[PDB]
Design an enzyme around this catalytic site. Structure first.
Site, PDB file in Angstrom:
ATOM      1  CG  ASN A   1     -17.468  18.920  35.022  1.00 40.29           C
ATOM      2  OD1 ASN A   1     -16.332  19.226  35.409  1.00 40.29           O
ATOM      3  ND2 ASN A   1     -17.715  17.814  34.328  1.00 40.29           N
TER       4      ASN A   1
ATOM      5  CB  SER B   1     -24.084  18.253  34.030  1.00 38.57           C
ATOM      6  OG  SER B   1     -22.862  18.803  33.517  1.00 38.57           O
ATOM      7  N   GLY B   2     -21.679  17.134  36.063  1.00 41.64           N
ATOM      8  CA  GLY B   2     -20.794  17.514  37.138  1.00 41.64           C
ATOM      9  C   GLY B   2     -21.083  16.733  38.405  1.00 41.64           C
TER      10      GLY B   2
ATOM     11  CB  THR C   1     -15.815  11.690  33.564  1.00 41.98           C
ATOM     12  OG1 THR C   1     -16.811  11.923  32.555  1.00 41.98           O
ATOM     13  CG2 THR C   1     -14.460  11.452  32.902  1.00 41.98           C
TER      14      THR C   1
ATOM     15  CB  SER D   1     -18.454  19.362  30.888  1.00 39.46           C
ATOM     16  OG  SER D   1     -19.663  18.676  30.781  1.00 39.46           O
ATOM     17  CB  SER D   2     -18.356  14.062  30.279  1.00 41.33           C
ATOM     18  OG  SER D   2     -17.873  14.220  31.617  1.00 41.33           O
TER      19      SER D   2
ATOM     20  N   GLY E   1     -27.726  11.697  32.095  1.00 38.48           N
ATOM     21  CA  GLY E   1     -28.957  11.052  32.477  1.00 38.48           C
ATOM     22  C   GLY E   1     -29.903  11.931  31.694  1.00 38.48           C
TER      23      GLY E   1
ATOM     24  CD  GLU F   1     -27.808  16.824  28.307  1.00 27.40           C
ATOM     25  OE1 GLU F   1     -28.150  17.372  27.224  1.00 27.40           O
ATOM     26  OE2 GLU F   1     -26.665  16.326  28.470  1.00 27.40           O
TER      27      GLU F   1
END
Ligand SMILES: Nc1ncnc2c1ncn2[C@@H]1O[C@H](COP(=O)(O)OP(=O)(O)O)[C@@H](O)[C@H]1O
Ligand SMILES: [Mg+2]
Lengths: 159, 145, 810
Positions: free
Chosen positions: C229, C178-179, C183, C232-233, C453, C455
């Site tokens: 992030n 994450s982050g 994206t 975040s997506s 990916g 988690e």
């Protein structure tokens, strides 16, 4: 040992010259070994000399004649003596482009900074007794230098 | 080099001649005395009779040549000798430095001993600290002060 | 190593012919220089000082210390030729010490992008870079990967290229934690093709203009501030671009996955809700606050204020105006637009209805709230509340009324909020896919993928397993792709060799999850008998699989924290411990079917939204869509962008070795390297190989007349190399690990001796020359030295001095 009568003959021819200047008496100073070989035509590296009988300072010990023969013998045997092929392969590793030319400084640095390093003297002497000129862009043909260097100083029959 | 020589002999020939004109008999001391007389100085006896017997029987000419040979076996031609000195100077003028020449004859080559390097100065053309080589050459046979 | 090594633009891609000659020239000793373990950068450089069994005493590089690591934590280091190595796979020495090194070295020079075999690594710069200017595009266009420096645009492009030359499909797989900015690259990759490919043919876009505006509109709803992030997506995306032979763009279609339903109504301490509520209550559009019947202040809304209300880098006033633009560009009606806001608003008002109960009978309090709520959904108040407070279920043979207590009537108002969003998300996706469908012939597609990916956390529930199961697949699709390609390659060179598809490896974890009666399957059952208990749900699970399918086991514990775990689904990444924590509630969408049916009447979006056309198990839908993806992905040339987060603190140039080295071990980067190694990971192209190791053994035959494969073969045979270590192909010579290492070694140790030899022919020229002179000068001297001696013995001979003056006597 397994040398010939001619070679032995050929070795004295030079030894005595060497003896003659430390004062004829039949003994030559170990630091001489290096140079005594270059005159019996070879081209050892200091490393090769050191290990072989050479010493690095003039009061270290003197060899006789029957003492150099073996030093000669054992050394006329190594055969990596260095070929026109190897030198030429090595200089490509400095040939920036491919045109055979090579910046004047750089060749002067390789010779002065790396491998078994050479004095700003020997380094300038040889560029002189081999007439190695720059060119407008100040570079040198390493092949011009290699041919001459390996020719000798006295090529055809005189100088 | 060694045991003979043309001009050299003939010179000992004519040389041996200014001595007997003081008589064609090889009229020796009588003229040993008399040949030094036209030169410039006086000689004792004992010499006249030892100078001569450095040779056995008689200082005939052939024999006059034998006492001279045993003493000239190397007197290598002149230029062969003037050039030698040239090899260790290549400065141009006519000289080898004291300092140099000294290492030279004393350390290198068939090494010169102290006793010889000494004598070598007594008569040596060494004025001011350099060394006129074209003279010990001239002092080879002989010429001047 | 790529086109005008001194282009201002390449400031962040490659070094300069100067700067790289430097990294490559720093000293080295394959007996002294190494890699060691460390507490703060995991590994550091070293020069071995002493050795005594294991007590190897090393002085590090920078520090100047002298630790004493046992032998095994003494890593082997790559020689200088490799410093700044552009593609991680050419490292003769393969190890983390290295992989980590090749990486920050490159990272701490401004180089985010960086290859390693099939994978292309990215590492979040955290700062605008010029890497993505148009002019750079062109520079990167048309080129094979090795003609330029490492960079997304090549991977984007070579993809595009192969699309055309191979007339087959292209899939680009962006990953990472994450982050770690996947994206970020995605919309680059997408923005790329939008220029490269664009065509030659009122408020509305352009098929390419429109492909792009998907992000705003999607992100104003898919993204939300998270600790890791700020943007975040909150979901997965597979967008696909179709190209018509000519190779231009024909349209694209979108896919979304796992919308976090939970923040609709819940937000952690630090975190925030979908960026859109904040953008709405923004000063940007005055009337709009009126129309969704709201008041300018994200603070008053229970469904928004539970964490933040602003992000360190966001201008919610702008975003909106931007977001409101991606709408127009995507061609949406003012009315369609309003409709998408009012719904967004009803989610506000929902959380503002208050309840009170008098015996299991909750009751409104401020009808005032529901009244609005009612005006948005276009239904009616009283009718709404009813379905809410008292519902007529349908106990088999009958439709009964019932009483709902405040907790209930509340929990209920949540679902309705979490359902109305999901619906709304989907309709929104659905509505774009609708404009990105021009219907123009479609030969092929390149499809991009942004998705978490694995988690793996400290406390693990449902939503966890979902994603982990997802990459559980994606991990073997890769392992597959590799197998194929690696086997193909060893054919093209005709090197005999036996392999094994490691996707087989991930087949247990994946079956147990999706098979007829494993986890998710059973979860559909439970999810179906009202009399459903979480305790119920582990009985069925435990039972069936318990100690019966290895990939299923007893969960590890915390202390008195996190909470109770139940079954440990050992995965690829590692192994997770999962929480039964109410998956049944989580899985199946609840909602007064009473309300549902009352909605199916009103104002439009409402309609489309609840107007269906029994299986909303968030899972059934995921396995459904998950496939639709794998069919697509195995029908494509896969391309891998492996994103990486440098460090926590959102900061430019900074490597938390610990963190980074972590990702490397659950990305697959250390796995390729682990796998390649029991292969011939080092593959050298004959020419290249001639130009570098001939010096080891050479000869007289001009180069232009020599044949590469012949040289290499002579060059190795002479050196004595074990045939085990290499495989000579039709185009490359395949080497085991240490080979390019040793070769490099034996080489510099040659070039050295060669130059000594030259300098030895030079010390021979010169010495030979004076030998002339000392030969002459010895004649001169013995002359002097023999006459001057002859003389000493005559200057005192009486006869002599006589002869002398009697000489001139003629
Ligand atoms: N290459 C880059 N250039 C400019 N900004 C970046 C880049 N990579 C990441 N960022 C920034 O880093 C943060 C992480 O972004 P994001 O791409 O959304 O990560 P992820 O998609 O993995 O969750 C964002 O705030 C973004 O602005
Ligand atoms: Mg993302």
């Amino acid at each position: 040992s397994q040398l010939t009568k001619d070679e032995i003959e050929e070795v004295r021819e030079v030894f005595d010259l060497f003896d003659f200047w430390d004062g004829r008496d039949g003994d030559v100073d170990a630091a001489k070994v290096g140079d005594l070989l270059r005159c019996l035509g070879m081209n050892p590296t200091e490393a090769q000399v050191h290990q072989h009988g050479g010493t690095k300072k003039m009061g270290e010990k003197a060899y006789k004649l029957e003492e150099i023969l073996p030093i000669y013998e054992e050394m006329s045997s190594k055969d990596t003596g260095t070929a026109a092929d190897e030198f030429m392969e090595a200089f490509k590793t400095f040939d920036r482009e491919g045109q055979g030319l090579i910046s004047s400084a750089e060749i002067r640095n390789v010779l002065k900074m790396l491998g078994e390093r050479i004095t700003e003297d020997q380094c300038n002497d040889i560029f002189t007794f081999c007439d190695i000129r720059e060119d407008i862009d100040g570079n040198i043909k390493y092949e011009d230098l290699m041919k001459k260097v390996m020719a000798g100083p006295f090529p055809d029959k005189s100088d | 080099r060694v045991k003979l020589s043309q001009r050299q002999m003939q010179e000992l020939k004519e040389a041996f001649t200014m001595i007997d004109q003081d008589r064609d008999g090889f009229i020796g001391m009588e003229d040993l005395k008399d040949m030094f007389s036209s030169l410039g100085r006086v000689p004792p006896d004992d010499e006249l009779n030892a100078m001569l017997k450095e040779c056995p029987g008689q200082l005939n000419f052939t024999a006059f040549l034998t006492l001279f040979g045993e003493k000239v076996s190397g007197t290598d031609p002149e230029d062969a000798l003037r050039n030698a000195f040239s090899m260790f100077d290549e400065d141009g003028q006519g000289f080898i430095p004291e300092d140099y020449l000294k290492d030279l004859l004393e350390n290198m080559g068939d090494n010169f001993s102290k006793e010889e390097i000494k004598n070598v100065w007594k008569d040596a053309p060494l004025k001011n600290k350099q060394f006129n080589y074209n003279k010990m050459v001239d002092i080879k046979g002989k010429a001047e002060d | 190593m790529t086109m005008d090594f001194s282009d201002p633009d390449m400031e962040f891609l490659c070094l300069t012919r100067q700067k790289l000659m430097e990294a490559t020239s720093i000293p080295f000793d394959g007996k002294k220089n190494c890699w060691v373990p460390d507490p703060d950068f995991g590994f550091v450089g070293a020069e071995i000082q002493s050795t005594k069994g294991d007590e190897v005493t090393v002085k590090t590089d920078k520090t100047q210390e002298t630790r004493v690591v046992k032998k095994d934590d003494i890593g082997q280091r790559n020689p200088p030729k490799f410093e700044m190595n552009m593609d991680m796979a050419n490292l003769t020495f393969l190890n983390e010490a290295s992989i980590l090194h090749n990486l920050r070295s490159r990272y701490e020079s401004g180089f985010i992008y960086t290859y390693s075999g099939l994978f292309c690594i990215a590492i979040n710069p955290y700062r605008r870079l010029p890497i993505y200017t148009q002019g750079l595009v062109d520079k990167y266009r048309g080129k094979r990967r090795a003609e330029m420096p490492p960079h997304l645009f090549s991977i984007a492009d070579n993809a595009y290229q192969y699309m055309l030359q191979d007339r087959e499909n292209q899939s680009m797989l962006i990953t990472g934690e994450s982050g770690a900015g996947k994206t970020e690259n995605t919309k680059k990759v997408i923005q790329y093709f939008a220029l490269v490919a664009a065509s030659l043919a009122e408020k509305k876009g352009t098929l390419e203009d429109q492909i792009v505006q998907c992000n705003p509109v999607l992100e104003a709803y898919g993204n939300a501030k998270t600790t890791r992030n700020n943007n975040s997506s909150r979901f997965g995306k597979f967008i696909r671009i179709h190209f018509g032979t000519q190779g231009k763009i024909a349209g694209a279609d979108i896919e979304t996955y796992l919308l976090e339903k939970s923040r609709v109504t819940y937000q952690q301490s630090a975190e925030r809700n979908y960026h859109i509520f904040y953008q709405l209550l923004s000063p940007a559009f005055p009337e709009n606050i009126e129309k969704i019947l709201a008041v300018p202040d994200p603070g008053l809304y229970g469904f928004i204020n539970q964490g933040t209300l602003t992000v360190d880098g966001i201008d919610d006033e702008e975003e909106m105006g931007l977001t409101d633009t991606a709408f127009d560009v995507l061609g949406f009606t003012d009315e369609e637009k309003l409709s998408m806001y009012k719904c967004t608003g009803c989610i506000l008002h929902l959380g503002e209805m208050k309840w009170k109960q008098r015996g299991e009978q909750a009751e409104a309090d401020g009808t005032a709230e529901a009244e609005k709520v009612a005006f948005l959904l276009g239904v009616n108040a009283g009718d709404l509340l009813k379905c809410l407070l008292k519902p007529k279920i349908k106990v088999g043979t009958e439709y009964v009324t019932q009483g709902r207590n405040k907790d209930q009537v509340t929990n209920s108002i949540a679902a309705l909020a979490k359902s109305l969003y999901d619906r709304m998300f989907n309709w929104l996706v659905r509505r774009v896919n609708q404009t990105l469908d021009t219907k123009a012939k479609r030969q092929f597609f390149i499809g991009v993928l942004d998705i978490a990916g694995f988690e793996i956390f400290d406390f693990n529930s449902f939503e966890q397993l979902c994603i982990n199961y997802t990459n559980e697949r994606l991990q073997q699709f890769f392992n597959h792709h590799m197998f194929v390609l690696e086997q193909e390659e060893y054919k093209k060179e005709g090197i005999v060799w036996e392999f094994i598809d490691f996707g087989l490896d991930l087949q247990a974890c994946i079956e147990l999850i999706e098979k007829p009666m494993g986890i998710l399957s059973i979860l559909e059952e439970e999810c179906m008998f009202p009399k459903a208990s979480d305790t119920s749900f582990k009985n069925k699970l435990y039972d069936n699989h318990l100690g019966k399918n290895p990939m299923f086991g007893k969960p590890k514990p915390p202390k008195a924290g996190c909470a109770e775990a139940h079954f440990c689904l050992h995965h690829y990444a590692g192994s997770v411990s999962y929480s039964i924590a109410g998956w049944l509630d989580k899985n199946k969408d609840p909602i007064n079917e009473n309300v549902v049916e009352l909605l199916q009447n009103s104002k439009e979006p409402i309609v489309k939204m609840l107007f269906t056309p029994a299986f909303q198990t968030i899972s059934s839908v995921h396995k459904e869509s998950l496939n639709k993806l794998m069919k697509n992905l195995y029908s494509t040339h896969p391309h891998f962008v492996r994103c990486i987060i440098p460090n926590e603190l959102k900061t430019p140039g900074l490597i938390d070795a610990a963190l980074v080295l972590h990702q490397l071990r659950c990305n697959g980067v250390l796995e390729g390297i682990r796998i390649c190694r029991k292969g011939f990971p080092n593959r050298i192209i004959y020419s290249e190989f001639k130009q570098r190791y001939s010096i080891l053994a050479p000869n007289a035959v001009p180069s232009g007349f020599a044949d590469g494969k012949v040289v290499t073969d002579k060059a190795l045979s002479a050196l004595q190399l074990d045939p085990n270590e290499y495989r000579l192909g039709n185009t490359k010579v395949f080497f085991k690990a240490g080979v390019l290492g040793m070769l490099e070694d034996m080489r510099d140790e040659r070039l050295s001796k060669i130059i000594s030899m030259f300098q030895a022919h030079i010390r021979g020229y010169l010495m030979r020359k004076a030998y002339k002179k000392l030969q002459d000068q010895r004649i001169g001297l013995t002359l002097i030295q023999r006459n001057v001696r002859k003389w000493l013995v005559l200057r005192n001979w009486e006869w002599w001095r006589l002869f002398n003056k009697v000489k001139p006597l003629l």
